[PDB]
From a paper:
To understand the Vpu-enhanced binding of BST2 to AP1, we determined the crystal structure of the BST2CD-VpuCD fusion in complex with the AP1 core at 3.0 Å resolution. BST2CD binds to the tyrosine motif-binding site on AP1 through critical interactions involving the YxY motif, while VpuCD occupies the acidic dileucine motif-binding site of AP1 through the ELV motif. Y8 of BST2CD forms the canonical interactions with μ1 residues and inserts into the conserved tyrosine-binding pocket on μ1. The relatively modest interaction mediated by V11 is presumably compensated by Y6, which stabilizes the binding through hydrogen-bonding interactions with N308 and E381 of μ1 and through stacking interactions with μ1 P383 and Y384. Unlike the canonical cases in which a leucine or isoleucine residue is found at the Y+3 position, V11 in BST2 only partly fills the corresponding hydrophobic pocket on μ1. Only a short region of VpuCD flanking the ELV motif is well ordered and successfully built in the structure. There is no direct interaction between BST2CD and VpuCD.
HIV-1 overcomes restriction by BST2 using the viral protein Vpu. For example, AP1 traffics cargo between the TGN and sorting endosomes, while AP2 selects cargo for transport between the plasma membrane and early endosomes. In conclusion, our biochemical and biological data support, and our crystal structure elucidates in atomic detail, how HIV-1 Vpu hijacks the AP1-dependent membrane trafficking pathway to antagonize the host restriction factor BST2.
Author numbering:
A (entry chain V): 59 to 68
B (entry chain S): 1 to 147
C (entry chain M): 2 to 138, 146 to 423
D (entry chain T): 4 to 14
E (entry chain G): 2 to 588
F (entry chain B): 14 to 583
The structure:
């Protein structure tokens, strides 16, 4: 999925 | 004391499991599927704490990855939330802009950091700097064996 | 019966769909995969799933699901038969029937869906006739669709008329753990390739025992067919009366008939594996394989599948003939013998290493299965005695034939 | 489809 | 050559399209791995074990790799030790009893020249250390506890905690090292040592007596933390080392459970923090959570306890579901003490039963039951019972349970008690435990004056529906015992209903035949009818027929019983009056 | 961008608008909501191009109900298409409109439907035939009003077998709504015509008219024979559904045949081979077939009496197939094959699918009930299973053995020792209770019964209720048999069952046992050890009327669930 790359924190 | 800590994806895939007590592999699996069922079934704005199986369960979802600690009744939920957050901060600094995929491909490193942050069920170092430096030096020592 | 038909992907989402009756919310299909997975864990897997008063009849082909919803006491036999028929049709329209095919042919698939079934009733399902007005490369409907001969259109012309018959027999076999045959049967298939002009009348002549006995040929060699199934083209009523296989064959390739009969012979290929297991250390397979048919005949491309432990390691093989390879992906070894002449007995030995600490879950114990193929051979002794071709123009048309015996469910239980 | 075909009588 | 690296495996497995294809990939790679393991390849053991751990997380078997981890632990390379210990923590178990090798390797690695190795052995021991391993390593732990190096000192402390947890007797052996470590300036060493002390006190009272001396010290340390400046370390959104603070406050709560002096000093600081901490973020609220817990659990100045209860009030009305949960939890902890301090919020608490959050709702329910007295019982019940009726499934069992419990403890009358009981058995029914049935019968059987009334409404209950099983159990049993009182249209508690005998037989036979009736309730009903043989006079022949035909079922119990009973009827028609009369009454 | 999509949707170029709607329904395909483009794609309906037209028709069929008011823009063109000189597009239009569930479009569909119903071409004719049922599902009143059903009934008499078949299907569906009221059955004379169409139409059509025939019932033996002789050949069709419908009408009509004439027997002989061949089909069809076969062997046991072997389960069979197969095997177990069946079950118990193994052992039990001698053999088999030391098998085996002892009380051999040797490491309360009961009932032979039972009092109150009761009865039977080192034991157990017990039922039974010790020992000897009457098991046979009703539903969901349609369809 896309969100597998999304930052945990940001 | 934290009985165990799990990291699992939104879609119920295990990313990390630290057991701070002795349990049979089979039972560990039963616990994991059960708890994961329960937590994932919850609607997004539910309470970050729940009562499961004579224990207290704290969970926070960062992006797509769920962090889930199992704490004893005499322990503080909000502080465990804080320790989880600390853990993701450690991860964030180590990998740099950490995402689930990093945990997926570096689960061993995640275990490493987790073991340099927790032990036996309790925190061993309440500094981010201390822990991160420890892991850093350990990685240097490890890289020595190769070269 | 079917209210809607869906083609789904492996995760259960709709690749393509067709709403036929409007009896069921299409959105109901969203419950298909979750229910399926639910029931599978319970060990309640079933070709028919329910979400209230909604039933899903489903089959699985490659990476696709074909699902039919119904809110009524649906005719399930018809639905499954239909689903498989859709699979066949699609398979003949597109080479490989897979997700990519669906996506990339959605148009003609919509057409085919609208033509195959109306309001839940199957309509025209013959791909070779369907291809006359549902084309990949304004037409009007072929009369064939509405003709008593609905599988062959008029106008077919070949400059060289000829017919091919493939008589293919599959031997099913099931041998007990001790080694005594529990079951054995011959399943036959007659596949034809018909290249004839016009609308010919064909008649098959077999050594059908019932036919011979009714024509005073009981002394001659026959075959007693326990059951026979015929292609649509065959005139069933005539067979019922006097065992006559009469038909106007469709154009090209088709399966004319299937038959089933018992066997009175020793199994064509006999496997005997004995196992010595030294727990926590090693396991050894000593296996002999003997071909029990005429030395004049020869079996090709024979593979002998033998299950081995899932935690086994460091394999060592020795054979008198042929090679062995470990296939861990299927937790088995495969002994391959390329050419296996009759009356021969070959040998094989395998040595595996086993973990010192035992497995957590017992894994299960599949039987030994074998695949083989013997050309110019029939265990049945069936013979296509004649193939009569009747054309108004009486052109010369010579038929051909060949006999192949191969494995069906050919498996030997293990202990 | 590699094996040989024998002819069959139109008897 | 050459065994693929971990990441490559991971990628490959993620390329799988079915669980089947994945399984095949696992089996293939694992085949390679095992065969490599046989060759005793010291080069690629590490990566293979790592790959095996990843595959073990996915649920695939990894037993064959277990004692390979040992080979990595007993290695001399650091990498091998790292992975080996990790895999030792993941794969090994107290089922293997490979205690000797683990123990010896840990011994060797604890006295290692490099601190990180010692860290591996320490973390491993502290995490999964067997009781026996703890026995044999305790000395080494103690010696390691007296190092100067912080990095190993903290782990030494927590490993000491672990060994204490696995063996209780050995805690005293750590006493000499536990003295004056508070003078430390390292927050890690501090925290860990506080954990060790907390465990210690929590184990033995004499240890409490001993360590409650350094209370003013840790009070000063805590006070320093609170009055500390911004340190770019230990600080989280404006608070320094809240883990340490919380640990200290927990230690304080245990150091002064029933003491007043300690309670006084800590009264001063608890006041300070309860007033001074910032509750804008989660951190502050956590500190205040544990603070409140401390203040309320210990014996102290009511002037502060008021303030604590106030804090909990402000929490309970907060919008953050988590906070409200915290409040309800806290209150739940301090109800067995300072009961009235909680009794101030009963309105709000019960109001939380309407909350949509399941956690909130549940805690609210638990607290609600924990608030029932002999006074509010008349009212609270109406609420709880209401809550039972409009309940979502997951709560019903617990709710019925607690209702029964409270009604057992604080029932104004027997009429009321029985009323609520019947109410629960009718509105909840299936959700009540079968094991609750006996405790109910006992209560209706120790209430003689009711009896016939209870029976009346019981029969009246089951004629409606005999689906809810415990209901028909209780019922059919009471019909059995008090059949005469049922039939005798006389009830000195409410207007009796017109009853008969054949209709009773109809309902009991209906219970016997019905698919909904379990085997045990069939038993109940059968024995009941048998009692009706003595308790009734008109139509005994019909029930003789009943027992006769029911003497042949596949049910072992039913057949045994019905056969015995048939023997009685056939031969000893006079003995039933002797043996089929009311049973003795228990507690 | 929707706006450019609209632009190309109205752009004067043919290709651009064609590709526009292609992208539109392609967007629709992947799950999008392309509803907002309703008016734009409709303007592409009036086309010379059949591909575009079909696509637009699909669009409408998908979105019209969601946009009922705008849908009227499709009406004109629609009716026009029902008069197009190409029959293909004509029927296309007809079958399309019958799917749009908007009242207006139905109104406008009425007349062109009427035309197409008597259209010259058979394709459009049968298409209309089905469209009639399509309409009837929307508004039965409307159909009655326009007198379409009469024209349908007349289309049954059509010259073209496809039109015939489709009309048969349609009308048959209509008659479901009008059960016996205004019955739409025809005479034998018509049955002949249907029987001809049967030989003259598609496989699916064959199914249709077989399903139609099935609702009829022959008036005598002569007619029944007459039509059975014309359906019987259908059992050789490759299509399994055809075969199964044939089976249906045959199983239903064979009743009216005189059982003293040979034809009945011939029919039974002729009905077995197709039923076996069904088990060689794809798994789903195997399942369906299996269910219906269960019904049949229950109704006509003579057909598949000796066809046991085909019902053995193969390793690679899906679990459902395995389960059904077990059932059939039990139902076909006779003295002639029990050794082989027991061999099979013994093998099945080796599997790892737990529920399958359980069902298999239980099946051993059922076999032991069905046949007589089997029992001994059965027990032997069971014993062997117990020696596999696999607990979940052991417990089951104990329970079924208990059942066998209960039904056939001649099993007093050395067997009763062997199981006692199993350490009694059993956990399942059912197994414990079974073992307890066994000890008690046969305590005469078990000298150490005295001891064994005693070992189960340790933790009496934590043990299950059933176990408590059975232990009570067991000890009572033991002591009552031999008042030796037993009186103190039974004293203990009675004290536990009455004085220490809070379980009302146990309290009752125990108290009666004490009231029976105290009053009379001989009375108890004649009471608790009374010769029990034989145990009467509830049959697994479905009620004959419900069975006969279920036979009429062969090949339908009813034949899978074994329930009437009224029981599961909403």
């Amino acid at each position: 999925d896309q969100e597998e790359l999304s930052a945990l924190v940001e | 004391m934290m009985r165990f800590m799990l990291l699992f994806s939104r879609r119920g895939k295990l990313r990390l499991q630290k057991w701070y007590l002795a349990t049979s592999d089979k039972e560990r699996k039963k616990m994991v599927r059960e708890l994961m069922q329960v937590v994932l079934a919850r609607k997004p704005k539910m309470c970050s704490f729940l009562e499961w199986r004579d224990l207290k369960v704290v969970y926070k979802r960062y992006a797509s990855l769920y962090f889930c600690c199992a704490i004893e009744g005499q322990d503080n939920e909000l502080i465990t939330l804080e320790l989880i957050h600390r853990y993701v901060e450690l991860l964030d600094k180590y990998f740099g802009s950490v995402c689930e995929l990093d945990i997926i491909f570096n689960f061993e490193k995640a275990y490493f950091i987790l073991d340099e942050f927790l032990m036996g069920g309790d925190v061993q170092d309440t500094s981010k700097k201390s822990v991160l430096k420890a892991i850093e030096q350990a990685d240097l020592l490890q890289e020595e064996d190769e070269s | 019966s079917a209210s809607a038909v869906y083609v789904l992907d492996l995760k259960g989402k709709v690749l393509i769909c067709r709403n036929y009756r409007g009896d069921v919310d299409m959105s109901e299909v969203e419950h298909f995969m979750p229910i399926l997975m639910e029931k599978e864990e319970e060990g309640m897997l079933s070709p028919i799933l329910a979400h209230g008063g909604v039933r899903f009849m489903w089959i699985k082909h490659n990476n696709l699901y074909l699902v039919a919803t119904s809110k009524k006491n649906a005719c399930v036999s018809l639905v499954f038969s239909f689903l498989y028929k859709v699979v066949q049709v699609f398979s003949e329209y597109f080479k490989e029937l897979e997700e990519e095919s669906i996506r990339d042919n959605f148009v003609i698939i919509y057409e085919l869906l609208d033509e195959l079934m109306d309001f839940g009733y199957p309509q025209t399902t013959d791909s070779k006739i369907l291809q006359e007005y549902i084309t990949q490369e304004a037409p009007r409907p072929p009369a064939t669709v509405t003709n008593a001969v609905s599988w062959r259109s008029e106008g077919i012309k070949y400059r060289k008329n000829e017919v091919f018959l493939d008589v293919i027999e599959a031997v099913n076999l099931l041998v007990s753990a001790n080694g005594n045959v529990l079951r054995s049967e011959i399943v036959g298939s007659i596949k034809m390739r018909v290249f004839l002009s016009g609308m010919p009348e064909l008649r098959l002549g077999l050594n059908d025992k019932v036919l011979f006995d009714n024509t005073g040929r009981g002394k001659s060699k026959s075959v007693e067919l326990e059951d026979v199934k015929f292609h649509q083209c065959v005139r069933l009523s005539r067979f019922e009366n006097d065992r006559t296989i009469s038909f106007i064959p469709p154009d090209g390739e088709f399966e004319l008939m299937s038959y089933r009969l018992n066997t009175h012979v020793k199994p064509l290929i006999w496997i005997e594996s004995v196992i010595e297991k030294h727990s926590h250390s090693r396991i050894e397979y000593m296996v002999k394989a003997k071909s029990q048919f005429k030395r004049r005949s020869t079996a090709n491309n024979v593979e002998i599948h033998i299950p081995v432990p899932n935690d086994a390691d460091s394999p060592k093989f020795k054979t008198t003939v042929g090679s062995v390879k470990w296939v861990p992906e299927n937790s088995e070894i495969v002994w391959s013998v390329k050419s296996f002449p009759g009356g021969k007995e070959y040998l094989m030995r395998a040595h595996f290493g086993l973990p010192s600490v035992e497995a957590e879950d017992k894994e299960g114990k599949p039987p030994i299965s074998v695949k083989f193929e013997i050309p110019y051979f029939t265990t049945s002794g069936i013979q296509v005695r004649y193939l009569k071709i009747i054309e108004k123009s009486g052109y010369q048309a010579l038929p051909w034939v060949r006999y192949i015996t191969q494995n069906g469910d050919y498996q030997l239980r293990t202990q | 489809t590699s094996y040989d075909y024998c002819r069959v009588p139109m008897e | 050559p050459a065994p693929i690296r971990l990441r490559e495996l991971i990628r490959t497995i993620r390329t799988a399209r079915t669980q089947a294809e994945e399984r095949e990939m696992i089996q293939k790679e694992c085949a390679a791995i095992r065969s490599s393991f046989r060759e005793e390849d010291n080069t690629y053991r590490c990566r293979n074990v790592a790959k095996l751990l990843y595959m073990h997380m996915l649920g695939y078997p990894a037993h064959f790799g277990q004692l390979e981890c040992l080979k990595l632990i007993a290695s001399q390379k650091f990498t091998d030790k790292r992975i080996g210990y990790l895999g030792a923590m993941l794969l090994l178990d107290e089922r293997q009893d490979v205690h000797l090798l683990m123990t010896n390797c840990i011994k060797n690695d604890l006295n290692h020249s490099t601190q990180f190795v010692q860290g591996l052995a320490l973390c491993t021991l502290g995490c999964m250390g067997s009781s026996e391993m703890c026995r044999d390593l305790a000395g080494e732990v103690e010696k390691l506890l007296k190092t100067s190096n912080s990095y190993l000192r903290k782990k030494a402390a927590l490993c000491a905690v672990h060994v204490i947890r696995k063996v209780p007797e050995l805690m005293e052996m750590f006493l000499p090292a536990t003295k004056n470590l508070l003078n430390e300036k390292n927050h890690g060493v501090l925290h860990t040592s506080v954990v060790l002390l907390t465990e210690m006190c929590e184990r033995s009272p004499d240890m409490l007596a001993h360590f409650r001396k350094l209370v003013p010290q840790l009070v000063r340390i805590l006070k320093n933390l609170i009055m500390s400046g911004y340190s770019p370390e230990h600080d989280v959104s404006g608070i320094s080392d809240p883990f340490l603070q919380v640990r200290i406050l927990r230690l304080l709560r245990i150091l002064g459970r029933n003491d007043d002096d300690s309670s006084e000093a800590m009264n001063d600081i608890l006041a300070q923090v309860a007033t001074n901490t910032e509750t804008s973020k989660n951190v502050g609220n956590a500190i205040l959570y544990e603070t409140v817990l401390t203040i309320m659990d210990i014996k102290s100045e009511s002037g502060l306890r008021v303030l604590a209860i106030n804090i909990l009030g402000r929490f309970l009305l907060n919008n953050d579901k988590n906070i409200r949960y915290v409040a309800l939890t806290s209150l739940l902890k301090t109800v067995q003490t300072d009961h009235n301090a909680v009794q101030r919020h009963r309105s709000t608490i019960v109001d939380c039963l309407k909350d949509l959050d399941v956690s909130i709702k549940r805690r609210a329910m638990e607290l609600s039951f924990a608030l029932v007295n002999g006074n509010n019982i008349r009212g609270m019940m109406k609420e709880l019972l209401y809550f039972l009726d409009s309940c979502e499934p997951e709560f019903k069992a617990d709710c019925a349970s607690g209702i029964f419990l409270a009604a057992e403890k604080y029932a104004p009358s027997k009429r009321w008690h029985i009323d609520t009981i019947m109410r629960v058995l009718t509105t909840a029914g299936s959700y009540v435990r079968d094991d609750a049935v006996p405790n109910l019968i006992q209560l209706i059987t120790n209430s003689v004056e009711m009896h016939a009334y209870t029976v009346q409404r019981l029969y009246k209950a089951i004629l409606g529906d005999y689906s809810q099983q415990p209901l028909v159990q209780v019922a059919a049993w009471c019909i059995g015992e008090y059949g005469d009182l049922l039939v005798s249209g006389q009830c000195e508690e409410e207007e009796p209903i017109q009853v008969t005998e054949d209709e009773v037989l109809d309902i009991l036979e209906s219970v016997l035949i019905s698919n909904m009736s379990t085997s045990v309730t069939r038993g109940y009903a059968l024995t009941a009818i048998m009692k009706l043989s003595t308790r009734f006079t008109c139509t005994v022949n019909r029930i003789k027929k009943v027992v006769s035909i029911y003497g042949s079922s596949i049910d072992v119990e039913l057949q045994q019983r019905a056969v015995e009973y048939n023997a009685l009827f056939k031969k000893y028609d006079h003995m039933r009056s002797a043996l089929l009369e009311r049973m003795p009454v228990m507690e | 961008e929707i706006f450019e999509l609209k632009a190309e949707l109205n752009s004067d170029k043919k290709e651009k608008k064609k590709e526009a709607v292609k992208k539109v329904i392609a967007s629709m395909t992947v799950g999008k909501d392309v509803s907002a483009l309703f008016p734009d794609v409709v303007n592409c309906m009036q086309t010379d191009n059949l591909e575009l037209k079909k696509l637009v028709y699909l669009y409408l069929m998908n979105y019209a109900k969601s946009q009922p008011d705008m849908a009227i823009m499709a009406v004109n063109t629609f009716v026009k298409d029902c008069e197009d000189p190409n029959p293909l597009i004509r029927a296309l239009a007809v079958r399309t409109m019958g799917c749009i569930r908007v009242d207006k479009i139905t109104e406008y569909l009425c007349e062109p439907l009427r035309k197409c119903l008597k259209d010259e071409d058979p394709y459009v004719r049968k298409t209309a035939a089905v469209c009639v049922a399509k309409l009837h599902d929307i508004n039965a009143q409307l159909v009655e009003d326009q007198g379409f059903l009469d024209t349908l009934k007349d289309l049954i008499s059509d010259s073209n077998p496809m039109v015939v078949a489709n009309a048969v299907a349609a009308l048959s569906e209509i008659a479901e709504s009008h059960p016996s009221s205004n019955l739409l059955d025809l005479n034998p004379q018509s049955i002949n015509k249907l029987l001809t169409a049967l030989n003259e139409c598609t496989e699916w059509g064959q199914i249709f008219i077989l399903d139609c025939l099935a609702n009829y019932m022959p008036k005598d033996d002569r007619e029944a024979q007459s039509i059975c002789e014309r359906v019987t050949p259908r059992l050789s069709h490759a299509n399994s559904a055809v075969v199964l419908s044939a089976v249906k009408v045959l199983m239903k009509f064979m009743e009216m045949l005189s059982k003293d004439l040979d034809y009945y027997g011939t029919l039974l002989k002729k009905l077995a081979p197709p039923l076996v061949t069904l088990l060689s089909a794809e798994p789903e069809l195997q399942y369906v077939a299996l269910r219906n076969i269960n019904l049949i062997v229950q109704k006509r046991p003579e057909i598949l009496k000796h066809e046991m072997k085909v019902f053995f389960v193969k390793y690679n069979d899906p679990i459902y197939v395995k389960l059904e197969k077990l059932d059939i095997m039990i139902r076909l177990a006779s003295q002639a094959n029990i050794a082989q069946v027991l061999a099979e079950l013994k093998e099945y118990a080796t599997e790892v699918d737990v529920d399958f193994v359980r069902k298999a052992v239980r099946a051993i039990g059922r076999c032991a009930i069905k046949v007589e001698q089997s029992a001994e053999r059965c027990v032997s088999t069971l014993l062997d299973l117990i020696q596999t030391k696999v607990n979940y098998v052991v417990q089951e085996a104990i329970v079924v053995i208990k059942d066998i002892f209960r039904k056939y009380p001649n099993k007093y051999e050395s067997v009763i020792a062997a199981l006692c040797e199993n350490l009694d490491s059993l956990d399942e309360p059912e197994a414990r209770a079974a073992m307890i009961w066994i000890v008690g009932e046969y305590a005469e032979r078990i000298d150490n019964a005295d001891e064994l039972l005693e070992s189960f009092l340790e933790g009496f109150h934590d043990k299950s209720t059933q176990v408590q009761l059975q232990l009570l009865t067991a000890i009572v039977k033991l002591f009552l048999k031999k008042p030796t080192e037993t009186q103190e034991l039974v004293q203990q157990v009675l004290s536990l069952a009455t004085q220490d017990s809070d379980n009302p039922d146990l309290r009752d039974r125990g108290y009666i046992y004490w009231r029976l010790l105290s009053t009379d020992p001989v009375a108890a000897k004649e009471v608790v050890l009374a010769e029990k009457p034989l145990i009467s098991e509830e049959t697994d046979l479905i009620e004959p009327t419900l069975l006969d009703e279920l036979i009429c539903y062969i090949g339908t969901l009813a034949s899978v669930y074994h329930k009437p349609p009224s029981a599961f369809v909403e």
